[PDB]
């Protein structure tokens, strides 16, 4: 489906910030719709990281948000023959949002005395490659990096393509010929 | 938008009526199809199948198609000068020379088709498919096997047809 490609919209800034990495961090921290609390939840977390080390307030945040963060994803496709998979490369925008989502689900159940302590400790824990979504990033990227050896209904697609102009190689495809 | 042929006389022989269905794709619409025969009094190859929303608009469409891409054709006296067996598409019909003392002898819509054709005294049995849509080709194929009079002596009869172009 879809008659056209449609991109992201403009997202507005918040009354305490003009930086984007802050405004996008408060946004997917938003629950009950109320960002004006989440403003504080981000800035109270960042001060606690900053007491743990004073070189930066960003110490544990920047590498947690790299380390629990994927690069590739796998879809499953088959309309005949045998079961196959097709890996895709995805956008930074969704790599980032899986990672931040997983940080805020894991930290809110972490059960410490302030949401500020809970997030600084869960970024401190994933920064060192031993937190709760290191496993989730590692399994998901393994499966997408591995299924690059398969393609939608390969056995008829290999004859079908070379008859209707195409290659004699072995390649992944978006639910068509290969 | 085309040339048409006319007769100085009216023919409105409606032979068949039908309805068009697609049954799910837009469901079923009220449209009809129709077949109507336009002679001349001595004959035409005039046969028209057309279609529209309602029966009147449908027949008038079909009556129009019975007089475009068609021409009139002609035969002297109420008989045919050849005993020939006209066939058109499994509907096969017969003729043999006759008197004026007999006129039509036929039923249904066929007696009305033969009267304009000039082959009503010679009217002999039809065989194969004799339902309305194809039975009515008397005045088409039965006037393409045609013979018609032009001689004064039977022994000049083949000589007279040769000199008609030589």
């Amino acid at each position: 489906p879809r008659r056209r490609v449609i991109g992201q919209r403009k997202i507005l800034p918040d009354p305490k910030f003009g930086s984007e990495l802050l405004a996008k961090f408060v946004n997917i921290l938003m629950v009950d719709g109320k960002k004006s609390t989440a403003e504080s939840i981000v800035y109270s977390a960042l001060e606690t990281l900053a007491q743990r080390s004073g070189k930066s307030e960003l110490e544990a945040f920047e590498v947690a948000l790299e380390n629990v963060r994927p690069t590739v994803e796998v879809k499953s496709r088959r309309v005949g023959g045998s079961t196959y998979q097709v890996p895709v490369e995805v956008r930074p925008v969704r790599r980032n949002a899986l990672a931040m989502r997983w940080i805020v689900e894991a930290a809110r159940k972490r059960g410490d005395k302030s949401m500020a302590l809970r997030l600084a400790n869960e970024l401190s824990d994933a920064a060192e490659n031993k937190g709760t979504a290191v496993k989730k990033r590692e399994d998901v990227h393994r499966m997408a990096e591995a299924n690059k050896a398969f393609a939608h209904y390969r056995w008829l697609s290999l004859r079908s393509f070379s008859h209707q102009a195409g290659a004699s190689s072995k390649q992944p495809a978006l639910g068509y010929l290969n | 938008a085309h040339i048409e042929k006319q007769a100085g006389e009216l023919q409105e022989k409606l032979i068949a009526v039908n309805r068009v269905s697609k049954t799910v794709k837009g469901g079923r619409i009220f449209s009809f199809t129709a077949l109507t025969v336009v002679g001349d009094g001595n004959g035409r190859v005039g046969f028209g199948y057309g279609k529209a929303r309602e029966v009147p608009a449908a027949i008038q469409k079909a009556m129009e198609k019975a007089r475009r891409n068609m021409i009139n054709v002609a035969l002297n006296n109420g008989t045919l000068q050849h005993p020939v067996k006209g066939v058109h598409t499994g509907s096969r019909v017969f003729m043999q020379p006759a008197s004026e003392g007999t006129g039509i002898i036929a039923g249904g819509a066929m007696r009305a088709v033969l009267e304009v054709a000039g082959v009503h005294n010679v009217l002999a049995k039809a065989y194969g498919s004799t339902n309305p849509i194809n039975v009515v080709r008397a005045t088409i194929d039965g006037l393409e096997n045609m013979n018609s009079p032009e001689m004064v002596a039977a022994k000049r009869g083949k000589s007279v047809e040769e000199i008609l172009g030589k």
Binding site: - | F30, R53, E54, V55, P56, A57
Partner: protein, 232 residues
């Protein structure tokens, strides 16, 4: 047979209606029932002639009827007694002092309901209904209008089973929401049971009805551009 709601969800958004009055609050109900009654009883009294639109109107201190006909002065009677009687009953039902004026609509000699009268007769007498709807549309398009839709239903031709049939011609848009366009639903019985025609007729897409007002009401006709406004 989905039958999209053919005119109700299309009004008041530069599309005039068959009433123009103001009411609000809890008494809107007492004014509407009274307006139905005067619509029902008044057109029955002037039924001597055929009639093309009906407009009943309630401005400050008065009740004003506009009526539209295929010929003018015809429901107004002779002398002036006939029309004082029309004003007697308009006051009696609404309960306010009464006015009526006579006026005609765009394309007056044609109207939605006079097509359905023409189609009904053949059916009432149980003969000649197979070309009748088509001849009605032909006459109708010879007397005016830029497009017409006719839909007939009934135990049609006097049949012992029901039939839907319709006939459409020219330019009759169906998502249209600008200019008044004329509609009638007939209902009637004869020996075999009920018949009916739904008659949509389409005059114009900016021809007929009101137009959108081309100014504010705020600068115009104001001989003194202040009360004070701080400027004195």
């Amino acid at each position: 047979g989905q039958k999209v709601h053919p005119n109700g969800i299309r009004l008041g958004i530069v599309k005039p209606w068959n009433s123009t009055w103001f009411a609000n609050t809890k008494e809107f109900a007492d004014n509407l029932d009274s307006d139905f009654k005067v619509r029902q009883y008044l057109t029955k009294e002037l039924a001597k002639a055929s009639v093309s639109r009906i407009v009943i109107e309630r401005p400050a201190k008065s009740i004003r009827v506009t009526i539209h006909t295929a010929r003018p002065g015809i429901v107004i009677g002779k002398k002036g007694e006939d029309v004082e009687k029309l004003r007697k009953v308009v006051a009696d039902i609404a309960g306010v002092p009464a006015q009526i004026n006579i006026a005609e609509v765009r394309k007056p000699e044609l109207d939605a309901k006079l097509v359905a009268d023409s189609i009904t007769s053949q059916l009432e007498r149980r003969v000649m209904f197979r070309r009748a709807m088509k001849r009605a549309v032909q006459n109708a398009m010879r007397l005016g209008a830029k497009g017409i839709k006719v839909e007939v239903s009934g135990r049609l031709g006097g049949a012992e089973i029901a039939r839907t049939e319709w006939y459409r011609e020219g330019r009759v848009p169906l998502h249209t929401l600008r200019a008044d366009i004329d509609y009638n639903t007939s209902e009637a019985h004869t020996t075999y049971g009920v018949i009916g025609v739904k008659v949509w007729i389409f005059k114009g897409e900016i021809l007929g009805g009101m137009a959108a007002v081309e100014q504010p009401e705020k600068p115009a006709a104001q001989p003194k551009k202040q009360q004070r406004k701080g400027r004195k």
